[PDB]
Design an enzyme around this catalytic site. Structure first.
Site, PDB file in Angstrom:
ATOM      1  N   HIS A  41     109.048 -20.321  77.237  1.00  0.00           N
ATOM      2  CA  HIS A  41     108.510 -19.485  76.169  1.00  0.00           C
ATOM      3  C   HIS A  41     109.531 -19.170  75.083  1.00  0.00           C
ATOM      4  O   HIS A  41     109.175 -18.511  74.103  1.00  0.00           O
ATOM      5  CB  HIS A  41     107.899 -18.189  76.723  1.00  0.00           C
ATOM      6  CG  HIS A  41     108.871 -17.251  77.381  1.00  0.00           C
ATOM      7  ND1 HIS A  41     109.792 -16.506  76.674  1.00  0.00           N
ATOM      8  CD2 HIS A  41     108.995 -16.870  78.675  1.00  0.00           C
ATOM      9  CE1 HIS A  41     110.465 -15.731  77.509  1.00  0.00           C
ATOM     10  NE2 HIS A  41     110.001 -15.934  78.730  1.00  0.00           N
ATOM     11  N   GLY A 143     115.691  -9.360  76.030  1.00  0.00           N
ATOM     12  CA  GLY A 143     116.792 -10.290  75.873  1.00  0.00           C
ATOM     13  C   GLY A 143     117.379 -10.810  77.168  1.00  0.00           C
ATOM     14  O   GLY A 143     118.322 -11.614  77.124  1.00  0.00           O
ATOM     15  N   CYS A 145     115.631 -12.525  79.522  1.00  0.00           N
ATOM     16  CA  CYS A 145     114.923 -13.687  80.049  1.00  0.00           C
ATOM     17  C   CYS A 145     115.897 -14.845  80.192  1.00  0.00           C
ATOM     18  O   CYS A 145     116.775 -15.039  79.351  1.00  0.00           O
ATOM     19  CB  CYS A 145     113.759 -14.094  79.143  1.00  0.00           C
ATOM     20  SG  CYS A 145     112.532 -12.792  78.785  1.00  0.00           S
TER      21      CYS A 145
HETATM   22  O1  LIG Z   1     111.584  -9.825  77.780  1.00  0.00           O
HETATM   23  C1  LIG Z   1     111.767  -8.847  78.773  1.00  0.00           C
HETATM   24  C2  LIG Z   1     112.223  -9.182  80.037  1.00  0.00           C
HETATM   25  N1  LIG Z   1     112.402  -8.283  80.990  1.00  0.00           N
HETATM   26  C3  LIG Z   1     112.155  -7.005  80.767  1.00  0.00           C
HETATM   27  C4  LIG Z   1     111.697  -6.583  79.531  1.00  0.00           C
HETATM   28 CL1  LIG Z   1     111.359  -4.853  79.240  1.00  0.00          CL
HETATM   29  C5  LIG Z   1     111.497  -7.512  78.520  1.00  0.00           C
END
Ligand SMILES: Oc1cncc(Cl)c1
Ligand SMILES: Oc1cncc(Cl)c1
Ligand code: NA
Lengths: 301, 306
Positions: A41, A143, A145
């Site tokens: 993504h 941020g 991911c």
């Molecule tokens: O993109 C995201 C990944 N993990 C947690 C959050 Cl709150 C956002």
């Protein structure tokens, strides 16, 4: 003595963390040999998260659309393919810090360490378990991911998780490093919600054996139980069924303490019925289920 | 979202851990530039451990009596000296992985990460707080001595702890990297005990703020109090006193959530007096006191250190 939710040393994984940018999106990638792995993504805009057509978004990209940054060096992308829900970016330079590694898909109840990252830079490390509902209760901000979970065994890093998203209840979902999601989740901003969570019964038993090993016996009793009678009680507290496989896995901890598995199951039954009565076990006032039989043998005597 | 006991990434420190052997006793050393730091009790036998004379024991040892192993390479000892309770082994090779670093001494209630090691080989990392009684509740087995605690700020590793010993209650005691003990402990096998501990009030409040930031709001109430009135409650329930300095430190969380510190102490006051009444806070039935205000802010902001 003592008992701590201990993570694996993160150094071998720190050496592989990079930053991947596509358009306005920036997240983390895992740089092993000449391949950078990240969530696919990364190629979605605002408009795409509802019903993304990843094949159609990716066919419109060329190598130079992907910016990969390792430290402050820029890596040049020379190829790209999609495998399930992960993007694989071929780069011109092999990671000189690549450790010995493998990819492993884990089962619910297994634990691993998480290296949380932002902009290809590692933030912290902590221990997690894969819940029975295939989510993890992590700590992730926007941020993060592409942060990855792993175990280390004899200098070999087994990568088992990469972070893709947060579900509405504040728990987190991701894939193995082949891009297959754990559980029924999809990389889509659709209404999806985790199944009801359950307590990992076999882990609690192991953590109880750990308490006996560090010298605490107050919760034992003189009763025993059949396997099925235990499972009939424990499912009324939203505990996972305990199988014969789980009984065998606990055999070694049984032998070290001299408490048969079904006797420790009897103790757990009474703990569920009584509570802890102002006492603690290994410093906790709840029954702890994120240590595995393997973890307990690792950290204890 | 989410809140986890989180350690710093241990990579910069993993590259400094070496094994140090003197006789049978073998433990962990910290290799920075051309010096290896380790507990001075490495030179003692179990006989010597009961009443050691360290400079006498050290005047008899010679460089070749120290076997230093950096992975599979041997490092050759060309010098030995002693600063307080740590032994400094000058070695022939500077460590090429020496990170930017400082030796710092922390205060009770401040936290740090511990890289537990065995035969100079790191095996785990976890987060700890220096307790008000100057012990830490770590997880160490035999062979852990020489393991180190640290914080990372920007690129720089701040070393604050090195493990020396376990106490009979199962908690742990060590020095700073200049060899000064934390707390009233000595490096001899004698009868030593941890004093009575107290709960780190400012840290509990920080963790309550982390709960509010994460959606746990059930313990907030309409009330407020004053520093004087609360501290009487704190002393009764074996909590550290709350100072005006502590209140100032909690500022960035009081603003960021809209709950004033004395407002939140009103919640903590009720929690101490009435209990939890079946509910949890951040998945815990106990009031957690091993997250500093900075820890809460940094985990609920996103600060990274490459
Ligand atoms: O993109 C995201 C990944 N993990 C947690 C959050 Cl709150 C956002
Ligand atoms: O030598 C030891 C140091 N710390 C803890 C233990 Cl259990 C042993
Ligand atoms: Na209030």
């Amino acid at each position: 003595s003592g008992f701590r939710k201990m993570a694996f040393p993160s150094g071998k994984v720190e050496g592989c963390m990079v930053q991947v940018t596509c358009g306005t999106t920036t997240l983390n990638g895992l740089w092993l040999d000449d391949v950078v792995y990240c969530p696919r993504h990364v190629i979605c805009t605002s408009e795409d998260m509802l019903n993304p057509n990843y094949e159609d978004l990716l066919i419109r990209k060329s190598n130079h659309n992907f910016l990969v940054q390792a430290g402050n060096v820029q890596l040049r992308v020379i190829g790209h393919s999609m495998q399930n829900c992960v993007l694989k970016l071929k780069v011109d330079t092999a990671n000189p810090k690549t450790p010995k590694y493998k990819f492993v898909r884990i089962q619910p109840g297994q634990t691993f360490s998480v290296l949380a990252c932002y902009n290809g830079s590692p933030s912290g490390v902590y221990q997690c378990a894969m819940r029975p509902n295939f989510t993890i209760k992590g700590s992730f901000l926007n941020g993060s991911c592409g942060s990855v979970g792993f175990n280390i065994d004899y200098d070999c890093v087994s990568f088992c998780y990469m972070h893709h998203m947060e579900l509405p209840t504040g728990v987190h979902a991701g894939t193995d490093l082949e891009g297959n999601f754990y559980g029924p989740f999809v990389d889509r901003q659709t209404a999806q919600a985790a199944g009801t969570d359950t307590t990992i019964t076999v882990n609690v038993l192991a953590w109880l054996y750990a308490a006996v090993i560090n010298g605490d016996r107050w919760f034992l009793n003189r009763f025993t139980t059949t396997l099925n009678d235990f499972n009939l009680v424990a499912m009324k507290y939203n505990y996972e069924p305990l199988t014969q496989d789980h009984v065998d896995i606990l055999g070694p901890l049984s032998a070290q303490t001299g408490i048969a598995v079904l006797d420790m199951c009897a103790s757990l039954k009474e703990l569920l019925q009584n509570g802890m009565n102002g006492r603690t076990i290994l410093g906790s006032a709840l029954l702890e289920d994120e240590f595995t039989p393997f973890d307990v043998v690792r950290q204890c005597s």
